[PDB]
Write a protein that binds this ligand. Structure first.
Ligand SMILES: CC(=O)O[C@H]1C(=O)[C@@]2(C)[C@H]([C@H](OC(=O)c3ccccc3)[C@]3(O)C[C@H](OC(=O)[C@H](O)[C@@H](NC(=O)c4ccccc4)c4ccccc4)C(C)=C1C3(C)C)[C@]1(OC(C)=O)CO[C@@H]1C[C@@H]2O
Ligand SMILES: Nc1nc2c(ncn2[C@@H]2O[C@H](COP(=O)(O)OP(=O)(O)OP(=O)(O)O)[C@@H](O)[C@H]2O)c(=O)[nH]1
Ligand SMILES: Nc1ncnc2c1ncn2[C@@H]1O[C@H](COP(=O)(O)OP(=O)(O)NP(=O)(O)O)[C@@H](O)[C@H]1O
Ligand SMILES: Nc1nc2c(ncn2[C@@H]2O[C@H](COP(=O)(O)OP(=O)(O)O)[C@@H](O)[C@H]2O)c(=O)[nH]1
Ligand SMILES: [Mg+2]
Ligand SMILES: [Mg+2]
Lengths: 432, 451, 386, 113
């Protein structure tokens, strides 16, 4: 029985995790008090992927909430699903990182990491057969970036054979909210490229574009962005929980998506998205889902796939549908867009089908692409990084916490080498 | 327990403190006598926010503030006023003469025998605190006490506490109007301490505030009460992030991390956008874009300096009220496309953003309208050098002939100290001129090896 | 310069003499011929290498190569290059149970020692005779292993942890907190080597009774000091000798591994696959930019896929003079493995290198400008102007 | 789990009188359908030997397939499907889809058909 431990770090991670647990609890018919009030008998068949059982026939999520500022924790407890989490897993301190990666990684987080690892060990030792971990955090911040990277390193040291997922919100070109995002993003990526099996890139610019352009919302808040992200998280691990005509575990996705170890940065997507008023016009079927799947404007990372090539893609469908139609549509997508796929991987589309859709939909699907266009995003950060490291714009805050220019230089070099590795396969020719 | 200790020094400090504590008492539902009926009526709550007020067993709320002065007058006005029962009786007022517009009198001669009591009471307040965040020091350049005693206090605090942040709000002398003939000497003397021992210094100018009051609020004849109320609104906007919930909270450390590139450049300007009268509150939308644009207008700056003559090195926007992130992003994008607002090339990001849900409050008898949205901008820029250079000129015009110098030497200084301070000032000015320069063309001169 | 390539064929072990004992390796001069045991009609494919050693027949004089012969061919030349002021490397290669450990280390209690013993012997000798009032020498030793993509120190065993790998902007990758020790005599380096060999992880498998479980790197930092009154270059040369003993590729069926042994074999095979990929590419790119024409657009060599290739970035290419010693088994049953080694060895012949002598850059510029002044002065004086 | 599988097969075979053969259903392109089939066929050939062993396997289709790494899994199964099996029947998903579309007039067939 495959079971996942969930870790949340920082404000963004905590809020996305809260929305994600709301969505998952709705999917399995879990009351906010913890009781089960579902209808289908297949909701409880695999409840133990995310939830532990408790004596009063209750269910407690296997979640670990982490921060250095207490306030966010309070916002989780005083909420619709605050009481569902067990209070022993709320790990926090005082004197938050203050948007400083050094404080989160070296000075402050070094004290709380022991407690967080203790709770992680306690949750993992009770697992029947642990599958992997998944961490939600923001790269452009303080405690999120630093302590997420530290926890990832420690866990990979302790559990090398397990899967390490990661849902990261990374800085956008236009939408900037802190002045020192490039430093934190560069160091975080330097850690992640080493110590992670899969990393799903998420960008606020792309999510705002989806909300404005596709969903036609006029006032999108952070709740809607958390909604989209949580839908993606559920779509990724659907196949562990429900039966289907063609299953797809996390390891299957990892094997079929990662050709070489360092290229595991994925562009996520979801379909359908109908804007609450155009759904009465669009007929729902596999071709429409596929058409919205590969559309440029639907991607969540703000990187145009038409500027590169798809090393690999994976599509996980949910709903009763024919496999012939799915295979034909993926094959058509490959042949028609013959210039956006590499020529040294025959059939570089992975397919999975699950029988049970979401609660309110007859059909749904999720998209995990792996393309060279992601290099663009890294290049952007690198540019900004140079513009602040040539003059040492804010370096004293980081060097006061016990860092040196050596770490900055090596992180920049690692990011540039990653960019070059992606750029190797971008241009055409190569062949056979 | 995001706790802050406020220190008010001198007449300007005490009066700004009166305004600040009126605002804080009204925000939290505290009465002038220290009781909070809201908890009694409701039955309990978190309204006794520990940032400013400490709760005793009986339900009284004592502020975390320290008033200091050498004149009994300014604080005897407080001991017998409306708020006589709010403050702890210990108010640290030397029953002697005043510094007499003399840095030496307040630093060397009379600043002693009052400093020990002040640090003892500050120690008592800091021992009551858990997770102390920093100090907020209110004082005035150009005065004797507010310069010299603030210098001594800051030095001793930096010796004792060390790592805690020390923010400073101060009234810089104006270009034209002045209230003393020996302002430049005191300002140039205290710059040597505020440069080393502070972490971030916010400067305000009375000519700018008078102009804002005349133009925006349509007040023809303002007094110091209006200026103190505006400064109180600004400090409340700064400190709101650690008292109420919000979409994005910005603590006091994020301030210093984002607004201070180098240790010697910690002199940002401050502005408040929706400064408007009740009558003109109508006929206006007061959207996010309007207030964000108004923050960048040179006329609304609180120090008589033109940002168009310099370059922006960092900006921090703190929003209050019915504000959502997408409008903030749109406003920042609109500002980034204007050619009159120039950013240094070595700071591509530029902006820090914080949002708080609590809207600003209205003080009865005030002059600011009730609004749904507000923003306080803090901008670290290079135009501030101009505001210093004028003062330097004034200093020279008096020091060539050694006018008013014997008063300073008679109180325990020597002449060379003056020169030392002036030299330091030049160095600081030079640093600004070196950091606003564009990076040399293709910073690695040029390049392009083989392939 | 090019990578030097030596191959060495070994005798039978107990496993091979118990089973079929037909040889497939034949050799002559500097040419090695493999013969397919399954296809006697096929051509006897042959490969040309810079050196080829035959240790199959102990008493015969038919091109028999003892330990000393290999040393005088490879290690003596590499130590000469080390005295010339060049960083040098010798690294072993092949499959499990072929001779890497024997060739690099050998058996201490015998007249049959490895390259590292004789190299340090000859170095200690040469510094001893050439010592003078003005000339002096200093040498330091270090020894690390890569077990499970984790670097461990051998000399100091009490460390008990995985050190951290860093990247100097100018000097490239290195290992932080590596216990480099100063030594003064051959007894000292002998004691260090014995402690290190005792510290290494070794386990018994069906293919080898003492199969190595970790890559190993032995580093000697050597410094020559030439101090005189005039301006004589002080601490002129600083060379690094890197002697690398890699673990060999394994097959689970023949090895019989289970549990920890199988995971160790998997990590070893991952590292060796990454090394082979890096070797193939350094090769093609060089050969191309070398034969192709000279565009030099962009070629990406995946150094970062493993820690082994990361630490040896400068030795496999760039700033070092490197030699590859491949081990070969004679048994027919191992044919499909042995050929593979030979194939990669052939590709190792194509790789090039760019090594230069070390010095302080300020002193480099000063010396170069002084030489230019001297040349211009001589030219002017010869022509009647100076 | 291979030992448990062989124990159950032995228990079934002991009950059987005049056992004629095995019918092994698996799929090229999957991890288990290749690796486990190889293990099981090897052990069955070692144990039983003279009993017939038929295979009904699903070969990868020329165009459509549901995994990127199918060719590796299909090629690595060659030794076991060549040496140990006696007669292997191979079927393709595309051909059966075409048969369903043309003969049975099923526009959108699924794996049940
Ligand atoms: C007629 C009807 O039922 O209305 C739909 C609907 O109108 C649309 C527009 C829904 C609707 O979603 C939105 O309006 C929306 C707004 C901001 C961000 C994201 C969504 C819907 O709200 C969302 C809601 O979706 C669900 O319930 C899914 O199961 C979803 N779960 C939740 O949204 C959820 C909400 C609160 C608490 C717990 C879960 C889900 C999706 C994927 C994986 C797991 C769960 C549905 C069916 C609808 C409404 C109600 C209007 C959509 O919802 C999704 C993401 O599945 C948006 O586009 C789809 C397609 C639908 O047509
Ligand atoms: N904005 C504002 N400025 C003030 C206020 N009170 C005094 N000032 C300024 O403070 C300057 C004089 O310094 P003071 O603060 O009076 O110095 P002090 O506290 O009296 O100390 P002593 O000179 O020793 O008595 C004047 O130039 C005023 O402009 C006030 O209430 N509001
Ligand atoms: N040229 C040679 N002459 C004589 N004996 C040799 C020769 N080469 C190897 N041997 C012996 O043959 C065996 C295999 O050599 P060995 O050095 O153990 O291979 P290895 O690759 O280092 N072991 P492993 O760690 O599993 O790769 C040892 O017993 C050696 O002493
Ligand atoms: N999608 C989403 N992004 C968020 C949310 N809150 C903050 N962010 C992003 O996170 C960044 C700030 O990082 P932060 O969470 O403060 O890092 P931390 O201080 O370590 O927790 C900003 O760039 C925001 O865009 C949220 O609720 N949803
Ligand atoms: Mg006074
Ligand atoms: Mg060995």
């Amino acid at each position: 029985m495959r079971e996942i431990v969930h870790i949340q770090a920082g404000q963004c991670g905590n809020q996305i995790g809260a929305k994600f647990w709301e969505v998952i609890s709705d999917e399995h018919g879990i009351d906010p008090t913890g009781s089960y009030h579902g209808d289908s008998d297949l909701q409880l068949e695999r409840i133990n992927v995310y939830y532990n059982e408790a004596t009063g026939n209750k269910y407690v999520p296997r979640a670990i909430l982490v921060d250095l500022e207490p306030g966010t924790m309070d916002s989780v407890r005083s909420g619709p699903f605050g009481q569902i989490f067990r209070p022993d897993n709320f790990v926090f301190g005082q004197s938050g990182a203050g948007n400083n990666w050094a404080k989160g990684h070296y000075t402050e987080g070094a004290e709380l990491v022991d407690s967080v690892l203790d709770v992680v060990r306690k949750e993992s030792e009770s697992c029947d057969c642990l599958q992997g971990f998944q961490l939600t955090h923001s790269l452009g911040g303080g405690t999120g970036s630093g302590m997420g990277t530290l926890l990832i390193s420690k866990i990979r040291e302790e559990y090398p054979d397990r899967i390490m997922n990661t849902f990261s919100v990374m800085p956008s070109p236009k939408v900037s909210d802190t002045v020192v995002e490039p430093y934190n993003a560069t160091l975080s990526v330097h850690q992640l490229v080493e110590n992670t099996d899969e990393t799903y890139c998420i960008d606020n610019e792309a999510l705002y574009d989806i909300c404005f352009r596709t969903l036609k919302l006029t006032t999108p808040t952070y709740g809607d962005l958390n909604h989209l992200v949580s839908a993606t998280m559920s779509g990724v691990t659907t196949c562990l929980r429900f039966p289907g005509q063609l299953n797809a575990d996390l390891r299957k996705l990892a094997v079929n998506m990662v050709p070489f170890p360092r290229l595991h940065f994925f562009m996520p997507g979801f379909a359908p998205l109908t804007s609450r008023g155009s759904q009465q016009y669009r007929a729902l079927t596999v071709p429409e889902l596929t058409q919205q799947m590969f559309d440029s404007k639907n991607m969540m990372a703000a990187c145009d796939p038409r500027h590169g090539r798809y090393l690999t893609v994976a599509a996980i469908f949910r709903g009763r549908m024919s496999m012939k139609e799915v295979d034909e549509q993926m094959l058509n997508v490959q042949n028609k867009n013959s210039s956006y796929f590499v020529e040294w991987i025959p059939n570089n589309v992975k397919t999975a089908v699950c029988d049970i859709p979401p609660r309110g939909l007859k059909m749904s699907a999720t998209f995990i692409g792996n393309s060279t266009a992601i290099q663009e995003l890294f290049k952007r950060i690198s540019e900004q990084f140079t513009a602040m490291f040539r003059r040492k714009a804010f370096l004293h805050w980081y060097t006061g916490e016990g860092m040196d220019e050596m770490e900055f230089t090596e992180a920049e070099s690692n990011m540039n080498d990653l960019v070059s590795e992606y750029q190797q396969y971008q241009d055409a020719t190569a062949d056979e | 327990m995001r706790e802050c200790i406020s220190i008010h020094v001198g007449q300007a400090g005490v009066q700004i403190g009166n305004a600040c504590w009126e605002l804080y008492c009204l925000e939290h539902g505290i009465q002038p006598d220290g009781q909070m009926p809201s908890d009694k009526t409701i039955g309990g709550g978190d309204d006794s926010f520990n940032t400013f007020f400490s709760e005793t067993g009986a339900g009284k709320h004592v502020p975390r503030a320290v008033f200091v002065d050498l004149e009994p007058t300014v604080i005897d006005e407080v001991r017998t006023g409306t708020y006589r029962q709010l403050f702890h009786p210990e108010q640290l007022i030397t029953g002697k003469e005043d510094a007499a517009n003399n840095y030496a009198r307040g630093h060397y001669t009379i600043g002693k025998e009052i400093i020990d009591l002040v640090l003892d009471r500050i120690r008592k307040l800091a021992d009551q605190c858990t997770g102390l965040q920093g100090f907020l020091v209110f004082h005035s350049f150009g005065g004797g006490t507010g310069s010299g005693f603030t210098s001594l206090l800051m030095e001793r605090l930096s010796v004792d506490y060390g790592k805690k942040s020390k923010l400073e709000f101060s009234i810089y002398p104006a270009p034209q109007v002045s209230t003393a003939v020996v302002e430049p000497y005191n300002s140039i003397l205290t710059t040597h301490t505020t440069l080393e021992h502070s972490d971030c210094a916010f400067m305000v100018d009375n000519e700018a505030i008078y102009d804002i009051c005349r133009r925006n609020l349509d007040i023809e004849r303002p007094t110091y009460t209006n200026l103190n109320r505006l400064i109180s609104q600004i400090v409340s906007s700064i400190t709101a992030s650690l008292r109420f919930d919000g979409a994005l909270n910005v603590d006091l450390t994020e301030f210093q991390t984002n607004l201070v590139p180098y240790p010697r450049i910690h002199f940002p300007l401050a502005t408040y956008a929706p400064v408007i009268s009740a009558e003109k509150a109508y006929h206006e939308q007061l959207s996010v874009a309007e207030i964000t644009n108004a923050c960048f207008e040179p006329a609304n700056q609180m120090v008589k300096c033109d940002p168009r003559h310099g370059k922006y090195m960092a900006c921090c926007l703190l929003y209050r009220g019915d504000v959502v992130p997408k409008d903030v992003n749109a406003a920042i994008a609109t500002i980034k496309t204007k050619r009159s607002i120039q950013f240094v090339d070595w700071c591509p990001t530029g902006f820090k953003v914080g949002i708080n849900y609590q809207p600003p409050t209205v003080v009865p008898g005030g002059d600011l309208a009730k609004v749904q949205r507000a923003v306080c901008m803090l901008s670290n820029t290079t135009a501030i050098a101009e505001a210093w250079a004028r003062l330097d000129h004034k200093f020279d015009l008096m020091y060539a002939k050694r006018a008013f110098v014997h008063w300073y030497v008679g109180e325990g200084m020597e002449e060379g100290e003056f020169s030392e301070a002036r030299e330091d000032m030049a160095a600081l000015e030079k640093d600004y001129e070196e950091v606003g320069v564009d990076s040399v063309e293709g910073e690695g001169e040029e390049e392009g090896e083989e392939y | 310069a090019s990578v030097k390539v030596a191959v060495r064929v070994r005798p039978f072990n107990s496993r091979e003499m118990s089973r079929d004992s037909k040889c497939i390796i034949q050799m002559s001069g500097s040419t090695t011929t493999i013969v397919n045991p399954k296809q006697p009609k096929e051509t006897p494919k042959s490969f040309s290498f810079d050196y080829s050693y035959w240790s199959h027949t102990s008493p015969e004089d038919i091109n028999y190569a003892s330990q000393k012969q290999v040393y005088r061919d490879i290690g003596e030349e590499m130590l000469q290059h080390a005295f010339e002021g060049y960083n040098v490397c010798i690294f072993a290669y092949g499959q499990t149970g072929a001779g890497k450990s024997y060739t690099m280390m050998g058996k201490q209690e015998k007249d049959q020692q490895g390259i590292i013993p004789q190299l340090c012997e000859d170095l200690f000798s040469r510094i001893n005779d050439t010592t003078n009032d003005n000339m002096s020498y200093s040498v330091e030793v270090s020894y690390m292993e890569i077990y499970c993509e984790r670097v461990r120190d051998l000399l100091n065993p009490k460390n008990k942890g995985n050190l951290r790998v860093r990247e100097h902007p100018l000097l490239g990758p290195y290992v932080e907190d590596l216990s480099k020790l100063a030594v003064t005599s051959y007894n000292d380096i002998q004691d260090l080597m014995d402690s290190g060999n005792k510290a290494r992880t070794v386990a018994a498998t069906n293919m080898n009774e003492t199969s190595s479980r970790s890559h190993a790197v032995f580093n000697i930092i050597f410094t020559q000091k030439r101090h005189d009154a005039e301006t004589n270059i002080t601490t002129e040369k600083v060379s690094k000798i890197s002697l690398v003993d890699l673990a060999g590729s394994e097959r689970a069926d023949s090895t019989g591994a289970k549990g920890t042994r199988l995971k160790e074999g998997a990590n070893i095979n991952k590292s060796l696959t990454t090394l082979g990929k890096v070797i193939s590419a350094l090769a093609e790119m060089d050969s191309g930019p070398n034969k192709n024409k000279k565009k030099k657009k962009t070629d990406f060599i995946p150094y970062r896929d493993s820690v082994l290739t990361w630490l040896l970035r400068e030795n496999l290419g760039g700033n070092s003079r490197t030699a590859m010693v491949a081990a070969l088994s004679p048994a027919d049953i191992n044919y499909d493995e042995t050929l593979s080694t030979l194939r990669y060895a052939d590709r190792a012949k194509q790789i090039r290198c760019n090594a230069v002598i070390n010095e302080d850059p300020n002193n480099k510029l000063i010396r170069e400008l002084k030489d230019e002044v001297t040349r211009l002065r001589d030219l002017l004086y010869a022509q009647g102007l100076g």
